[PDB]
RNA sequence: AAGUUAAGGGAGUGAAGACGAUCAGAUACCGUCGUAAUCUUAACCAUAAACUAUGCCGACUAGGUGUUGGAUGAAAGUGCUUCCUUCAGUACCUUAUGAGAAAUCAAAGUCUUUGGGUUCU
RNA sequence: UCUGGUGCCAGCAGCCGCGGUAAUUCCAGCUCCAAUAGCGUAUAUUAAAAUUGUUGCAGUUAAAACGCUCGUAGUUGAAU
């Protein structure tokens, strides 16, 4: 859109200086504007667009001197269907503004998800690479790899999140108080986030560093 | 019950709140009672004066820029 | 990962800490990179550099100074460690 | 009480910043200047703004006033504090050191000809 | 009282590895520890190590490569048959593509794939991811 | 180099304090009979020179921020930013400068210099939220948390701070082509001294 | 929920401690829990102090002091305001 | 601790009991008396918020300030005191890509990456 | 959030609950939903239950470390 970038990353993304969103993942840079994520995922020049889903709305009260004081929390889960996933939450006075804020918050937390094989590797990886575990509050979750023809075997919320993430095959089990929706969602998200951090043997070899976009586009950003 | 819906900026007290605000009330007879309707619009900084001339707002002190 | 037809299927390859080899993930904001400039036998900086990467774990524990000292000593840039 | 709200003070501060060369230490002239420069529908608020302008102008004579950026003062202070001494105090003929400092320096193998303890 | 020297060694190695320590010291040593360390060495999970010779039970110092996720023992050394490897590996290992389960066998110490290749059972010692 | 260490001895940069702060053991030579810790002064030169090389590696000088909190370090930091092309703060630090993108003084840099990590705790805390390589100037009691390169000196004496910033600026200029070596920098200390 | 780490008194590596009696209300309290106060008072106020001075022989007289060493129980001590009620963080501040 | 049996002892305190007050009532809180008991010797009883509400043995993991008892090496003393190490006991402070539902915790850590030994519930 | 009747009654409802004139829950009419030559109810039993735990639970404050020590049977024991 016709939006005025506020950060250096926003300026570089507004121009065509950055080719893929995996370039900013590699350097562990923060993202402060949802317009970057909108720019990288458009209905044009993109094979798989994003999707949203309001998964829960719950009211909360504060109980001032003249009675209660209600408002609503909104949880949304965003997903690409291919290696990208996110989760957002927002509290507000009206439901519409809360869901808008949650949609914005989910986009800021989009992360890459790794995928693997059960048995022998063939085209199109289909499941988790190894067992991963996630924890939030008193809720613990565990995901394990499964063969090709299995579906997801889990609670409806797990199926929702894994379908957004792009995983087709998985077993699972859980422990704790999973009737709490927010902690269950956060535990699944934390388990998904751990995939690109495990250091399997095939990642042992050492490589040389690339150069950061700030250094590599210093002069063009100086011209401003 | 009552339901309120707001947007923007509005004033309540003083003499300006009677000049720059436009107000009406109506009622609708539904099958199970009466509902009251109450609308309030602040005009876009547009109000002639009692000594009629287009005024602005009794709350502003813009300072002009020196000529250069 | 390379499948049976020898095609890379990972969407990207993350970095490793130069001190502990700990595979920095995508949200670790306490990880940094240092570039040290080189001299040209006259005392003037040419266009070349050396690079190191440090993870947020060690940097939050407070051993970044000692680890960087050892790493730079390996590269003939310091006389001690 | 006679405390001045933030609207009055902000207007006065901007007026002082933008039109310093004209303003004086007399209330009537500053009232006329404030009539001409700014836009104030009521004469009462105009009187209060002009009064604070005059009060602020009086304070500036005594030194710096915080929140009002007047350049002439700034370059005057910069040229004051940029005085170059003709002799530096960094260089002296004899260095006096501790006994432990002298032992350290002798151990590190660096040579200084003018070191003396105590 | 010790009751086991393998468990203490593996626990110390695991604790040091979690901090990125680049070297660690193992106080009590034995032949079984040497064989376990050699098998970890053969898979490229650690570097070289020394054996310090006092006139008592010796001491070991090892070099670490920032590469081990976990190493532990199974305390009761259960007796495992050749056709029961599948359940144990399904329960214990994180994947079907990496990780090792260590049995002690009438033909020496070896992991589960080599045990299958040699057509032999044994008892369980431990594992490392 | 001999005259640099001679000037360092002219000031009191070699005397620290008590409170060894064990992570700074490798920089301390001995403890005197009065309890003061003596800094090596030979590692100080090498660390300063490495810091200068790291600083000059940065492509433009505007992506460098120098921070001081106490009154007796404002003149030195201002003049150091003047001779180089960096930005200085030298005063009250706003708690959300490096992380709040709506504030009026966001100013995200690439490298950050600290006069003292104990009093500049807020600035070094915010650096770990945005991948900023802090470089510091540490005494015998300074915490080395989120600090990448440490130069061992005393952060209290005004002349010591002035001398260290003067030395660092002179070395940075040498590493460029503004003046070749074998002739000293024409500007003098007492430009960097307080009051 | 264990509002105090030491349980309201300073006892470690012991089983039993002998009690004493409150100087105000007579209750029994263990010696390691009672609050102690030591007082160095004058016999009279300053006006009577000077009045005794010129009614005295020896031309150089000093009145004696009094030494008391009182001890109180919690209820009888914080009713007299030797000790007050503080906040959660301020409670930990000794001295 | 209380309580039971026998012989002593028996000042102060004082379950019971008797009064005097307060109160709408007061078999209570306050006050004046006062029996058993409390102390010693010889026997029973086996229970307490008998509490760190945290069983016992072994290993690993972090910085600082104290203190009680030994030993080692060095300076001011007018064969003693201070300082530096090290062993054993005992507290506190800060911090935790450590843990917990949290309060909090140097163990209540090294746990879905779950198995060092063992008893009780 | 369809119509008529009843009005803390009659009744419904495994559980939370509904029923005083506006009853989305009672009694009926219409319309929709599920399985379908099959579909409900009662009792017993398995999974759900990592709420019996070898794999695999908890014991400061939620239920739960014997008042403390000794001690036989049992279980477990450095390196070569
Ligand atoms: Mg008014
Ligand atoms: Mg007791
Ligand atoms: Mg008697
Ligand atoms: Mg009596
Ligand atoms: Mg009992
Ligand atoms: Mg108990
Ligand atoms: Mg488990
Ligand atoms: Mg059952
Ligand atoms: Mg069961
Ligand atoms: Mg089951
Ligand atoms: Mg249970
Ligand atoms: Mg006990």
UniProtKB/Swiss-Prot annotation, chain F:
GO terms for cellular component: cytosolic small ribosomal subunit. It comes from the Eukaryota. Signal peptide: none annotated. The keyword Ribosomal protein applies. One of its GO terms (molecular function) is structural constituent of ribosome. Component of the ribosome, a large ribonucleoprotein complex responsible for the synthesis of proteins in the cell. The small ribosomal subunit (SSU) binds messenger RNAs (mRNAs) and translates the encoded message by selecting cognate aminoacyl-transfer RNA (tRNA) molecules. The large subunit (LSU) contains the ribosomal catalytic site termed the peptidyl transferase center (PTC), which catalyzes the formation of peptide bonds, thereby polymerizing the amino acids delivered by tRNAs into a polypeptide chain. Component of the small ribosomal subunit. Mature ribosomes consist of a small (40S) and a large (60S) subunit. The 40S subunit contains about 32 different proteins and 1 molecule of RNA (18S). The 60S subunit contains about 42 different proteins and 3 molecules of RNA (28S, 5.8S and 5S). This is Small ribosomal subunit protein uS2. It comes from Plasmodium falciparum (isolate 3D7). The gene is RPS2.
């Amino acid at each position: 859109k016709n939006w005025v970038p506020v950060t250096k990353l926003g300026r570089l993304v507004k121009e065509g200086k950055i080719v893929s969103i995996e370039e900013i993942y590699l350097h562990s840079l923060p993202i402060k504007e949802y317009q970057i994520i909108d720019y990288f995922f458009q209905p044009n020049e993109c094979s798989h667009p994003l999707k949203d889903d309001v998964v829960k709305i719950m009211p909360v009260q504060k109980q001032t001197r003249a009675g209660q004081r209600t408002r609503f929390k909104a949880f949304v889960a965003i997903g690409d269907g291919n290696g990208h996933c996110g989760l957002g939450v927002k509290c507000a006075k009206e439901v519409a503004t809360a869901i808008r804020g949650a949609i914005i918050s989910a986009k800021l937390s989009l992360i890459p998800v790794r995928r693997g094989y059960w048995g022998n590797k063939i085209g199109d990886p289909h499941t988790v690479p190894m067992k991963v575990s996630g924890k939030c509050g008193s809720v613990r979750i565990r995901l394990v790899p499964a063969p090709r023809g299995t579906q997801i075997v889990g609670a409806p919320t797990t199926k929702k999140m894994l379908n957004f993430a792009g995983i087709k095959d998985c077993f699972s089990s859980s422990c704790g108080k999973t009737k709490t929706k927010g902690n269950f969602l956060r535990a699944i998200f934390n388990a998904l986030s751990k995939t690109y951090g495990y250091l399997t043997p095939d990642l042992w070899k050492v490589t040389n560093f690339d150069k950061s976009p700030y250094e590599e586009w210093s002069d063009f950003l100086e011209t401003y | 019950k009552s339901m309120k819906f707001r947007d923007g900026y509005l004033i309540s007290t003083g003499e300006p709140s009677k000049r720059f605000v436009n107000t009406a009330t109506r009622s609708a007879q539904l099958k199970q009672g009466v509902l009251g309707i109450k609308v309030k619009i602040m005009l876009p900084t547009a109000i002639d004066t009692r000594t009629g001339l287009t005024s602005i707002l009794p709350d502003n002190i813009s300072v002009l820029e020196p000529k250069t | 990962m390379f499948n049976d037809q020898k095609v890379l299927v990972d969407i990207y390859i993350p970095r490793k800490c130069s001190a502990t080899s700990r595979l920095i993930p995508a949200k670790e904001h306490g990880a940094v990179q240092i570039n040290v400039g080189m001299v040209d036998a006259n005392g003037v900086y040419n266009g070349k550099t050396e690079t190191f990467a440090i993870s947020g774990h060690v940097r939050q524990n407070g051993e970044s100074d000692a680890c960087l000292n050892r790493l730079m000593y390996e590269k003939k840039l310091l006389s001690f460690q | 009480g006679r405390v001045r709200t933030k609207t009055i003070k902000r207007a006065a501060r901007q007026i002082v910043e933008k039109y310093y060369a004209k303003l004086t230490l007399d209330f009537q002239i500053n009232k006329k200047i404030t009539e001409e420069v700014a836009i104030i529908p009521s004469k009462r608020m105009k009187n209060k703004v002009a009064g604070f302008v005059t009060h602020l102008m009086k304070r500036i004579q005594k030194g710096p006033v915080r929140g009002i950026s007047l350049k002439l003062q700034e370059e005057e202070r910069e040229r004051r504090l940029d005085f170059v001494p003709e002799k530096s105090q960094i260089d002296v003929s004899v260095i006096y050191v501790e006994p432990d400092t002298l032992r350290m320096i002798k151990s590190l193998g660096i040579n200084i000809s003018n070191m003396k303890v105590h | 009282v010790r009751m086991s020297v393998l468990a203490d060694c593996l626990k110390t190695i695991n604790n040091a590895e979690k901090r990125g320590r680049r070297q660690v010291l193992i106080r009590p040593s034995s032949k079984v520890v040497i064989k376990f360390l050699q098998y970890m060495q053969k898979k490229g999970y650690i570097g070289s190590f020394e054996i310090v010779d006092d006139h008592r039970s010796g001491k070991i110092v090892v070099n670490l490569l920032g590469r081990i996720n976990k190493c532990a023992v199974i305390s009761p050394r259960y007796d495992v048959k050749l056709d029961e490897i599948e359940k144990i590996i399904t329960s214990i290992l994180p994947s079907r593509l990496f990780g090792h389960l260590i049995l002690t066998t009438p033909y020496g110490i070896m992991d589960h794939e080599e045990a299958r290749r040699k057509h032999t059972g044994g008892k369980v010692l431990g594992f490392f991811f | 180099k001999e005259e640099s260490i001679a000037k360092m001895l002219i000031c009191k940069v070699h005397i620290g304090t008590k409170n060894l702060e064990n992570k700074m053991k490798r920089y301390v030579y001995t403890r005197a009979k009065d309890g003061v810790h003596i800094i090596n002064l030979a590692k100080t030169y090498e660390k300063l020179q490495l810091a200068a090389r790291i600083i000059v590696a940065i492509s433009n000088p505007a992506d460098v921020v120098v921070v001081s909190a106490r009154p007796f370090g404002s003149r030195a930091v201002l003049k150091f930013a003047q001779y180089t092309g960096a930005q200085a703060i030298a005063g009250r630090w706003t708690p959300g400068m490096l992380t709040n993108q709506i504030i009026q003084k966001f100013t995200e840099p690439r490298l950050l210099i600290v006069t003292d990590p104990r009093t500049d705790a807020q600035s070094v805390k915010e650096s770990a939220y945005a991948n900023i390589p802090v470089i510091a100037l540490c005494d015998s009691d300074s915490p080395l948390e989120h600090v990448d390169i440490a130069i061992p000196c005393n952060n209290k004496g005004k002349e010591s701070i002035a001398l260290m910033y003067w030395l660092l600026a002179q070395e940075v200029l040498y590493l460029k082509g503004v003046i070749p070596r074998s002739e000293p920098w024409n500007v003098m200390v007492d430009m960097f001294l307080w009051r | 929920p264990k509002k105090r780490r030491n349980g309201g008194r300073s006892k470690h590596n012991r089983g039993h401690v002998n009690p004493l009696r409150c100087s105000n209300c007579g209750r029994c309290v263990p010696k390691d829990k009672a609050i102690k106060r030591f007082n160095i008072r004058n016999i009279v106020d300053t006006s009577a102090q000077r009045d005794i001075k010129e009614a005295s022989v020896y031309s150089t007289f000093q009145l004696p002091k009094l030494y008391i060493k009182q001890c109180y129980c919690v209820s009888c001590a914080i009713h007299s305001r030797f000790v007050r009620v503080r906040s959660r963080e301020q409670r930990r501040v000794r001295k």
